[PDB]
Structure 1
Amino acid sequence: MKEITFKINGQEMIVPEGTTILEAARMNNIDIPTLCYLKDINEIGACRMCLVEIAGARALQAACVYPVANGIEVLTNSPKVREARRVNLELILSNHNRECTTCIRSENCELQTLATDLGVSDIPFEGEKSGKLIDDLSTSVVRDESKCILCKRCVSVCRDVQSVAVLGTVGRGFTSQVQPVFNKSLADVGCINCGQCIINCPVGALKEKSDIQRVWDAIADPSKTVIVQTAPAVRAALGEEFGYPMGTSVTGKMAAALRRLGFDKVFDTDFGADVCIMEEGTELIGRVTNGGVLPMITSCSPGWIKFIETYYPEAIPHLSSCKSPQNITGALLKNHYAQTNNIDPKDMVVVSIMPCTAKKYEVQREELCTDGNADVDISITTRELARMIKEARILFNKLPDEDFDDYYGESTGAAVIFGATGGVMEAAVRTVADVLNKKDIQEIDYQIVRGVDGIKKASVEVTPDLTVNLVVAHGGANIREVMEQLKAGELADTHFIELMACPGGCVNGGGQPIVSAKDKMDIDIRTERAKALYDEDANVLTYRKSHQNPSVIRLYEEYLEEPNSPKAHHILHTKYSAKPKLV
């Protein structure tokens, strides 16, 4: 490392090489506006809102992009800089529609914070905007260029850290805009419903499909009974849009709130996740004992499996025939509960929450059907739930706590850690060690590959005869490079491959409410999601193991016989097909 000298506002400072003015000023308690910059990803400076005066310069320079030098004295409180940024903010304000009463985020849009911060008074500059069209045909994500200000961050985050690269810039002048290839909809091109496309756009030009009207229609019919469902990782994100301090569990409070909304039944993803882990261990034993296709790979996320079937159809025979836990819960609820309670399956509606935005795609898929009936007919997100509860606008901070119902809402810590990154393999090795060798483990040593973050390797001795290797890969680049090396067959030795579509776990998923880039500067939010989840896990007073739950074996010798029964082969396992590619 090389030490270099500067002076900020008359204060001397020694910094290592690579330190820009912006981060050093933030370290030295000085704050400067930015829209262009985000950590490690987007460094173009093209917003031109981060201007600081540098003495001896011909014109002003952007703080984010400018690298330091030896002994330069700079100032940030001149009339020149304030008038220049006022002119540029007046200019950039002209395009986006000023109808902020209908802007989707509204109060969180930081452009509004810059407007109310920089004292913009009038808009002297009227005019005409770009060519308008709205592509409201995609089932997940909808664009609107009337609000976009062309910050390039969406195409940058899709291009590199996701390794998808399906967006680009088109045109010159005002014809410059962000588009996919050859201006068709996102539904027919190789988009993966990543959700990082929407979470980083600074203006809300990227939006979900607000499908609350049929939620209201379903709850409006008295003859239809409604069964709501909570994902195991949503509770660490509601207080974020309620302004709570970091990592506050609002579990029983939101249980009481959804009970006050009048919904007929409440349940969680926990029990179906337990069933799925037990099942996946059973096909683990089946494929190992019969020398099956190696490695075997789970199916927790719809995103990367759709990515594989739209990109790599030659990799099909390595998949798992089981589905996502939510589908399993929907199927068991519309079969076993329906037969027990004598309620007609087409007279029930089930709605569930999960922040992963790719789920709205699989509800479109017809192949996940039980006797020609879709397993779950409707689902909303955490932001969608936030918008609906602010329609209900119940005074959230003064609720008591409640518990879920019988049988299907019981709790274990092994699927409290399900929402974390790699807890699925942890619970799987726990249940296979308890079944085959009676081993009780809680945590596993992890050796991360040097130079790459997001890939993780381990070797766990499940039995003294058979040692199983662990590979956990989360993040698009990690998935891309493990795909490339398994394509050459370099990693035939291992047995578990954990492919996770979103980076940083589903606690870094799409549906979670927006955080500004300022708050991501101090603490990475996945760390406090991890601490809240781990405090929830370590305080589970009854069970830490999955298969030791009485209710799952009760339903096993009651209705589902054993895992991999022929009937379970017809209702719990199914095949996948390749999808057409027009990239």
Structure 2
Amino acid sequence: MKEITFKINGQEMIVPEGTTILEAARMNNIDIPTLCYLKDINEIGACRMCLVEIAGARALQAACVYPVANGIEVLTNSPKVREARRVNLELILSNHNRECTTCIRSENCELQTLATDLGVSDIPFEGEKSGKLIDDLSTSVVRDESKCILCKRCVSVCRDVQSVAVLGTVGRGFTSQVQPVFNKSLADVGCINCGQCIINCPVGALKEKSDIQRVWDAIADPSKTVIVQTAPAVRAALGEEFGYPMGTSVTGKMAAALRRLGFDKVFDTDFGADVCIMEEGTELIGRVTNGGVLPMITSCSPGWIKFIETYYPEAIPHLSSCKSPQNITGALLKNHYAQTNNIDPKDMVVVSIMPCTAKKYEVQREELCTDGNADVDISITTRELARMIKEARILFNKLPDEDFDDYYGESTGAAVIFGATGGVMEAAVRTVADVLNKKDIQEIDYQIVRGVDGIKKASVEVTPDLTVNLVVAHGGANIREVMEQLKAGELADTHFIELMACPGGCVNGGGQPIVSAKDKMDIDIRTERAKALYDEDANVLTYRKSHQNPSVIRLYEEYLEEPNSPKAHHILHTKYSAKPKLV
């Protein structure tokens, strides 16, 4: 590692070869405007707005992509730099729609903040805008190319960290636009509805398909009973919308807020998570002892399920037959709770609140229905929950703490670690070891693999006669690589493979509140969200294992008989089919 000496505004530093002016300023209490800058994702130098004067140069230089040299002199607050910045800002703002009052972003937009900071008093440049057409036809994502500023962050996000590549650029001059392949819609092409490009946009040209009106109509119907389902990772990041410091659990306040909205019943997904863990453990035992298909892969998250149905139909045998936990809870409420409470299966509405934007399409599928009825009717994200709370306008900072309802409100830490990455396999290994040997494990050490970061491997000895091999992966590129090596035949010894679409797990989903680069550089958000989830796991003083929950024990004793029973196979199991691709 060669050491390079440089000066920023007369302050000297030895640095590794290849540091930028912007990074040094950030670590030395100086800030420089950026629009098209993402760390490790977007280094394109296209927005042309981070210009910093360098002595002896013909013109100004962009700091985000300028490698520091030996003995250069740097000026930042000279009048020429400010004039160039304001001219560039008013030039870019000449095509944008200035209807800040009717934007969903509004308060937290990058362009609004930069315009307010730089003090652009007037817009002297007038003319015509670029063509506007809203693709409000896809299931979960909506493009609004009238607000696009062509920073190319969405393209790089979809190509690099997701390995899907369903976006590109077309045209020249004013006609240049970022569009999907062959002038089609995102519901027609090989998109997996993960929703990362939505949370990686600076101005708000990408949004979600809002379904708040359906919920509002459902609440006001006197003949319908409304039951809401709460995700485990929606209580780890909601506080952002209400000024709370990050890493704070808002379980009681969130429950109280949902009870004040007029919901008839409130339940948690953790019951379905425990049921799913039990079913997957029983399936693992059955496949191991009867020579089943190995390795066995959990199939909870819809994202990579769509990914594998679209791209890798060869290995669809390997998927588990169980449903996602929220589908388990919905089907159970629609059948057993309906029978117990003398309520017609068609006379109740169940809505789920999940940080994912692929569950909007997941619930919409026609196959995931029980007895001719939809398991889950409506699904809304965390941002839509915050918008609903703000529209109802209840003070969220002064709410007391309230408890969940019985019996689907009973929770275990095995289903609280479930939201973060590595929690599903953690709970599965704990439960299977306890069942098979009474072997008490609490944490698993995961090996960091050289060359590829984010893919995890472990090997815990369950029985002296059986050691199990484990693989955990999150992120599109990691799933691509692990599926490629599985097809190549290098994973014959593997037993468990867990795959998550969104990098970092469901704590970094597509429906979580959006943070800018400023708040992103200070703290890695996924790590401390997972830390908050683990701390909540350490604060659960009742039961730390899934099979010790009295609710699931009573359920299996009264209705479900034994795991993997014919009734359980009929109710909680579904099949998967390949989907054609049009890219």
Shorter-chain TM-score: what band?
over 0.9
The aligned residue for residue 559 of structure 2 is: 559
Deviations 1:126-177 (A, max 9, x none): 1111122111110100101110101001001101111111100000111110
Structure 1 residue 222, shift from structure 2 partner = 1.2
Q: CA deviation at 1:462?
A: 0.8
Following superposition, the deviation at residue 97 of structure 1 comes to 0.6
Do the aligned residues in 2 keep the contact of 1:6 with 1:73 (CA within 8 Å)? no
Shift of 1:21: 0.7
State the distance in 2 between where 1:364 and 1:352 align: 13
**2:240 maps to what in 1?**
240
* TM superposition shift of 1:559: 0.5
- Alpha carbons 2:310, 2:578 under 8 Å: kept: yes
In 1, Cα distance between equivalents of 2:239 and 2:550: 34
Cα distance in 1 for partners of 2:213, 2:411 equals: 32
Q: Which ranges of structure 2 fall in alignment gaps of 5 or more residues?
A: none
Q: Distance in 1 between matches of 2:362 and 2:12?
A: 57
Aligned to 2:397: 397
| Further displaced range: 190-199 or 126-135 | 126-135
CA distance in 2 between counterparts of 1:175 and 1:388 reads 37
What are the superposed Cα offsets for residues 8-33 of structure 1, whole Å, 9 maximum, x if unpaired?
Answer: 11222221112111101111111111
SS in 2 for 1:293: coil
Cα offset, 1:432, TM superposition: 0.5
C-alpha offsets along residues 74-132 of structure 1, whole Å, 9 cap, x if unaligned? Answer: 11011111001111101000111111111111100011010000010001111111122
Kept in 2, the 8 Å contact 1:476–1:501? The answer is: yes
Corresponding residue of 1:491: 491
Offset at residue 334 of structure 1 (A): 0.7
Q: For 2:313 and 2:446, how far apart are their aligned partners in 1?
A: 31
CA deviation string 1:234-283 (max 9, x = no partner): 11111111121121211101111111111110110111101100110010
**Deviation digits for residues 438-478 of structure 1, max 9, x if unmatched?**
01111011111012111000111011100001100101110
Q: Distance in 2 between matches of 1:201 and 1:462?
A: 45
Question: Aligned-pair RMSD on alpha carbons?
Answer: 0.8
Moved more, 4-13 or 38-47: 4-13
Residue 190 (str. 1) matches residue 190 (str. 2): yes
State the distance in 2 between where 1:124 and 1:151 align. 23
Farther-moved stretch of structure 1 (114-123 vs 445-454): 445-454
How far residue 346 of structure 1 moved from its aligned partner, in angstroms, is 0.7
Q: Deviations over 1:354-398 (max 9, x none)?
A: 111100011220000001111001110000001100001111111
SS in 2 for 1:306: helix
Tell me which residue corresponds to 1:109. 109
8 Å Cα contact 2:237/2:246 also seen in 1: no
- Pairs within 5 Å for 1:221-240: 221-240=221-240
Question: Helix, strand or coil: the match of 1:271?
Answer: helix
Instruction: Give the TM-score taking structure 2 as reference length.
Output: 0.99
1:213 CA drift (Å): 0.9
Q: Secondary structure at the match of 1:234?
A: coil
Contact 1:368 1:374 in 2 (8 A): yes
Report the secondary structure of 1:456's partner residue. strand
Look up the SS of the partner of 1:436 in the other structure. helix
Measured after TM superposition, the shift of residue 306 of structure 1 is 0.7
Cα drift, residue 300 of structure 1: 1.4
Equivalent-residue separation in structure 2 for 1:81 and 1:245 (angstroms): 36
Shift of 1:492: 1.0
Secondary structure of the residue that 1:467 maps to in structure 2?
Answer: strand
Match of 1:481 in 2: 481
The offset of 1:197, in angstroms, is 1.3
- Where 1:349 maps in the other structure, the secondary structure is strand
Q: Is the contact between residue 94 and residue 126 of structure 2 (CA under 8 Å) also seen in structure 1?
A: yes
Q: Does the 8 A contact of 1:230 with 1:352 survive in 2?
A: yes
**What are the equivalent positions in structure 2 for 1:76-155 lying under 5 Å apart?**
76-155=76-155
Unaligned 5+ residue runs, structure 1? Answer: none
Q: What is the alpha-carbon distance in structure 1 between the residues aligned to residue 152 and residue 496 of structure 2?
A: 37
Query: TM-score, structure 1 length as denominator?
Result: 0.99
Q: Distance in 1 between matches of 2:181 and 2:566?
A: 45
1:171-212 deviations in Å (ceiling 9; x for gaps): 011111001111111111001112111110111100111111
Secondary structure of 1:462's aligned partner: strand
3-state SS of paired residue (2:15)? strand
CA shift digits 1:535-570 (9 cap, x unpaired): 111011111111011211111020111111112111
* Residue equivalent to 1:166: 166
How many Å separate the matches in 2 of 1:383 and 1:557?
39
SS in 2 for 1:166: coil
Query: Could you tell me how far 1:581 is from its partner in structure 2?
Result: 1.3
Q: CA deviation at 1:327?
A: 0.6
Give % identity. Answer: 100
Structure 2 Cα separation of the partners of residues 101 and 533 of structure 1: 36
SS at match of 2:548: coil
